[PDB]
Design an enzyme around this catalytic site. Structure first.
Site, PDB file in Angstrom:
ATOM      1  N   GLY A 195       0.786  -1.229   0.000  1.00  0.00           N
ATOM      2  CA  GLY A 195       0.000   0.000   0.000  1.00  0.00           C
ATOM      3  C   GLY A 195       0.817   1.276   0.000  1.00  0.00           C
ATOM      4  O   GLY A 195       2.029   1.256  -0.247  1.00  0.00           O
ATOM      5  N   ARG A 196       0.135   2.410   0.237  1.00  0.00           N
ATOM      6  CA  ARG A 196       0.753   3.740   0.276  1.00  0.00           C
ATOM      7  C   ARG A 196       0.065   4.573   1.339  1.00  0.00           C
ATOM      8  O   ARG A 196      -1.139   4.821   1.237  1.00  0.00           O
ATOM      9  CB  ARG A 196       0.624   4.493  -1.076  1.00  0.00           C
ATOM     10  CG  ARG A 196       0.893   3.698  -2.354  1.00  0.00           C
ATOM     11  CD  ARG A 196       0.803   4.554  -3.603  1.00  0.00           C
ATOM     12  NE  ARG A 196      -0.579   4.707  -4.064  1.00  0.00           N
ATOM     13  CZ  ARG A 196      -0.933   5.325  -5.186  1.00  0.00           C
ATOM     14  NH1 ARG A 196      -0.010   5.850  -5.986  1.00  0.00           N
ATOM     15  NH2 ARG A 196      -2.213   5.420  -5.523  1.00  0.00           N
ATOM     16  N   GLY A 197       0.836   4.999   2.337  1.00  0.00           N
ATOM     17  CA  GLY A 197       0.399   5.907   3.394  1.00  0.00           C
ATOM     18  C   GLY A 197       0.582   7.360   2.966  1.00  0.00           C
ATOM     19  O   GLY A 197       0.990   7.622   1.820  1.00  0.00           O
ATOM     20  N   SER A 229       4.376   7.439   3.824  1.00  0.00           N
ATOM     21  CA  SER A 229       5.116   6.194   3.553  1.00  0.00           C
ATOM     22  C   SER A 229       4.609   5.350   2.349  1.00  0.00           C
ATOM     23  O   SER A 229       3.465   5.477   1.917  1.00  0.00           O
ATOM     24  CB  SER A 229       5.192   5.319   4.807  1.00  0.00           C
ATOM     25  OG  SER A 229       3.917   5.014   5.347  1.00  0.00           O
ATOM     26  N   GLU A 230       5.508   4.505   1.808  1.00  0.00           N
ATOM     27  CA  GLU A 230       5.274   3.512   0.752  1.00  0.00           C
ATOM     28  C   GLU A 230       5.515   2.178   1.475  1.00  0.00           C
ATOM     29  O   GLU A 230       6.578   1.986   2.081  1.00  0.00           O
ATOM     30  CB  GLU A 230       6.263   3.697  -0.412  1.00  0.00           C
ATOM     31  CG  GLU A 230       5.988   4.917  -1.272  1.00  0.00           C
ATOM     32  CD  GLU A 230       4.999   4.702  -2.402  1.00  0.00           C
ATOM     33  OE1 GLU A 230       3.825   5.113  -2.252  1.00  0.00           O
ATOM     34  OE2 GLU A 230       5.412   4.160  -3.453  1.00  0.00           O
ATOM     35  N   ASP A 248      -4.936   7.770  17.060  1.00  0.00           N
ATOM     36  CA  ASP A 248      -5.392   7.351  15.729  1.00  0.00           C
ATOM     37  C   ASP A 248      -5.982   5.930  15.748  1.00  0.00           C
ATOM     38  O   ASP A 248      -5.762   5.146  14.826  1.00  0.00           O
ATOM     39  CB  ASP A 248      -4.257   7.494  14.695  1.00  0.00           C
ATOM     40  CG  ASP A 248      -4.675   7.609  13.232  1.00  0.00           C
ATOM     41  OD1 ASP A 248      -5.857   7.981  12.969  1.00  0.00           O
ATOM     42  OD2 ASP A 248      -3.816   7.359  12.347  1.00  0.00           O
TER      43      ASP A 248
HETATM   44  N1  LIG Z   1       3.240  -1.760  10.820  1.00  0.00           N
HETATM   45  C1  LIG Z   1       2.789  -2.600  10.193  1.00  0.00           C
HETATM   46  C2  LIG Z   1       2.245  -3.683   9.436  1.00  0.00           C
HETATM   47  C3  LIG Z   1       2.261  -5.049   9.763  1.00  0.00           C
HETATM   48  N2  LIG Z   1       1.610  -5.821   8.862  1.00  0.00           N
HETATM   49  N3  LIG Z   1       1.188  -4.917   7.900  1.00  0.00           N
HETATM   50  C4  LIG Z   1       0.539  -5.190   6.732  1.00  0.00           C
HETATM   51  C5  LIG Z   1       0.226  -4.113   5.907  1.00  0.00           C
HETATM   52  C6  LIG Z   1       0.539  -2.809   6.308  1.00  0.00           C
HETATM   53  N4  LIG Z   1       1.252  -2.555   7.437  1.00  0.00           N
HETATM   54  C7  LIG Z   1       1.543  -3.611   8.218  1.00  0.00           C
HETATM   55  N5  LIG Z   1       0.232  -1.737   5.486  1.00  0.00           N
HETATM   56  C8  LIG Z   1      -0.307  -1.883   4.120  1.00  0.00           C
HETATM   57  C9  LIG Z   1      -0.958  -0.525   3.867  1.00  0.00           C
HETATM   58  C10 LIG Z   1      -0.091   0.438   4.662  1.00  0.00           C
HETATM   59  C11 LIG Z   1       0.266  -0.336   5.939  1.00  0.00           C
HETATM   60  C12 LIG Z   1      -0.576   0.064   7.139  1.00  0.00           C
HETATM   61  O1  LIG Z   1      -0.230   1.385   7.548  1.00  0.00           O
HETATM   62  O2  LIG Z   1      -2.333  -0.465   4.265  1.00  0.00           O
HETATM   63  C13 LIG Z   1      -3.173  -1.299   3.440  1.00  0.00           C
HETATM   64  C14 LIG Z   1      -4.000  -2.234   4.242  1.00  0.00           C
HETATM   65  C15 LIG Z   1      -3.799  -3.524   4.455  1.00  0.00           C
HETATM   66  C16 LIG Z   1      -3.963  -4.625   3.475  1.00  0.00           C
HETATM   67  O3  LIG Z   1      -4.002  -5.918   4.107  1.00  0.00           O
HETATM   68  C17 LIG Z   1      -2.815  -6.572   4.326  1.00  0.00           C
HETATM   69  C18 LIG Z   1      -1.883  -6.190   5.277  1.00  0.00           C
HETATM   70  C19 LIG Z   1      -0.732  -6.952   5.469  1.00  0.00           C
HETATM   71  C20 LIG Z   1      -0.542  -8.122   4.738  1.00  0.00           C
HETATM   72  C21 LIG Z   1      -1.488  -8.526   3.797  1.00  0.00           C
HETATM   73  C22 LIG Z   1      -2.651  -7.769   3.609  1.00  0.00           C
HETATM   74  N6  LIG Z   1      -3.590  -8.153   2.657  1.00  0.00           N
HETATM   75  C23 LIG Z   1      -3.648  -9.377   2.087  1.00  0.00           C
HETATM   76  O4  LIG Z   1      -4.493  -9.651   1.237  1.00  0.00           O
HETATM   77  C24 LIG Z   1      -2.652 -10.390   2.580  1.00  0.00           C
HETATM   78  C25 LIG Z   1      -1.310  -9.797   3.001  1.00  0.00           C
HETATM   79  N7  LIG Z   1       0.208  -6.513   6.426  1.00  0.00           N
END
Ligand SMILES: N#Cc1cnn2c3cc(nc12)N1C[C@H](C[C@H]1CO)OC/C=C\COc1cc(cc2c1NC(=O)CC2)N3
EC number: 2.7.11.1
Length: 331
Positions: A45-47, A50-51, A155
């Site tokens: 994803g993209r914050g 952050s990327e 938050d």
């Molecule tokens: N700190 C931390 C952290 C730990 N795990 N994790 C994951 C994503 C993530 N951060 C973390 N993101 C991704 C993005 C920005 C950030 C959140 O600010 O937001 C998008 C939302 C989440 C999408 O859902 C997933 C999140 C993670 C792993 C997967 C999925 N979705 C799948 O279909 C299987 C794999 N792990």
């Protein structure tokens, strides 16, 4: 005359009693690592700042999350890094594994514990009454801990709650908005996302505390048990208070304004109107009723209060009858 001051009901002076280096994040010397220890696999994803990527730490061949930071104030980065380090090892708090910098780009990145998350949209619909109770207790473990450690998350929302349902593993993430609690400190009210903003943020009352997170937890709980995401669906920050006022009523709102001698923005004068406090039963219907119970409604009512000082603490909330079966199963 200005606003009446406020002090946190719990963990008031925890930061005064700790060494200066604990909360004095501006003085924190950052421990950089090797950018080449991690190899990026794909984008997650993209914050705003952050990327986000899934990476593999090559030294121990394990799955990590890399948040490559966009330019943001160094003291804001030092704050997040310090908070994450103070909270490391805490119940349901995400682990900061490393802090790395690209050798050529000089751009920083934070390395975190990976949580194989089931998207909150596809997950919440499948969640049972027990699942809501169980995960609500897990978030409360994280909040009681960080509050006891002198930190407000600021938050709390579904996006910042990572759940790996298969392994029943919850992590409270994104501490980039978190701040250290100091008695008498006037904080920035332009924090949290619209639908989770406490009345104190909406009425511009700066002397807030950990109780802000308890309001955000309430908004999450109401969205889950009523299957109504977001629960308070405001068009802007002004209509957001109007949405709350249509549910909690205007009498308790104006009582809160009076108590803390809050100067209410002229905009609110013609939009808040007059509203009765609604009974929670009006949000109950055939497709959500199996999630709603007298214990859930008692709990939710005790979280969703205008007066931040009258809300349940994370510890009081963990002691509520709503979690009796969760607490019993943990033993
Ligand atoms: N700190 C931390 C952290 C730990 N795990 N994790 C994951 C994503 C993530 N951060 C973390 N993101 C991704 C993005 C920005 C950030 C959140 O600010 O937001 C998008 C939302 C989440 C999408 O859902 C997933 C999140 C993670 C792993 C997967 C999925 N979705 C799948 O279909 C299987 C794999 N792990």
């Amino acid at each position: 005359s200005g606003p009446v001051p406020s002090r946190a009901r719990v963990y008031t002076d925890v930061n005064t009693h700790r060494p200066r280096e604990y909360w004095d994040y501006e003085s924190h010397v950052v421990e950089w690592g090797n950018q080449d220890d991690y190899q990026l696999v794909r984008k997650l994803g993209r914050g705003k700042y952050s990327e986000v990527f899934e990476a593999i730490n090559i030294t121990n061949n394990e799955k990590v999350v890399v948040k490559i930071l966009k330019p943001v104030k160094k003291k804001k980065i030092k704050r997040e890094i310090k908070i994450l380090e103070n909270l490391r090892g805490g119940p349901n708090i995400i682990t900061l594994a490393d802090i790395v910098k690209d050798p050529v780009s000089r751009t920083p990145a934070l390395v975190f514990e990976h949580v194989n998350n089931t998207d909150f949209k596809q997950l919440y619909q499948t969640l049972t009454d027990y699942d809501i109770r169980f995960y609500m207790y897990e978030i409360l473990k994280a909040l009681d801990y960080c509050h006891s450690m002198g930190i407000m998350h600021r938050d709390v929302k579904p996006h910042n709650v990572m759940i790996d349902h298969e392994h029943r593993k919850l992590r409270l993430i994104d501490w980039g908005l978190a701040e250290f609690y100091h008695p008498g400190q006037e904080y920035n009210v332009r924090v949290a996302s619209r639908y989770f903003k406490g009345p104190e943020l909406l009425v511009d009352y700066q002397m807030y505390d950990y109780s802000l997170d308890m309001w955000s937890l309430g908004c999450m709980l109401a969205s889950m048990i009523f299957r109504k995401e977001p629960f308070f669906h405001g068009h802007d920050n002004y209509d957001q208070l109007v949405r709350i006022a249509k549910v909690l009523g205007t009498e308790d709102l104006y009582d809160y304004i009076d108590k803390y001698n809050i100067e209410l923005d002229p905009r609110f004068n013609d939009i808040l109107g007059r509203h009765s406090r609604k009974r929670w039963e009006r949000f109950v219907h055939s497709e959500n009723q199996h999630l709603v119970s007298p214990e859930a409604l008692d709990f939710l009512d005790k979280l969703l209060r205008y007066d931040h000082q009258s809300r349940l603490t994370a510890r009081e909330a963990m002691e509520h009858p709503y979690f009796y079966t969760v607490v019993k199963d943990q033993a």
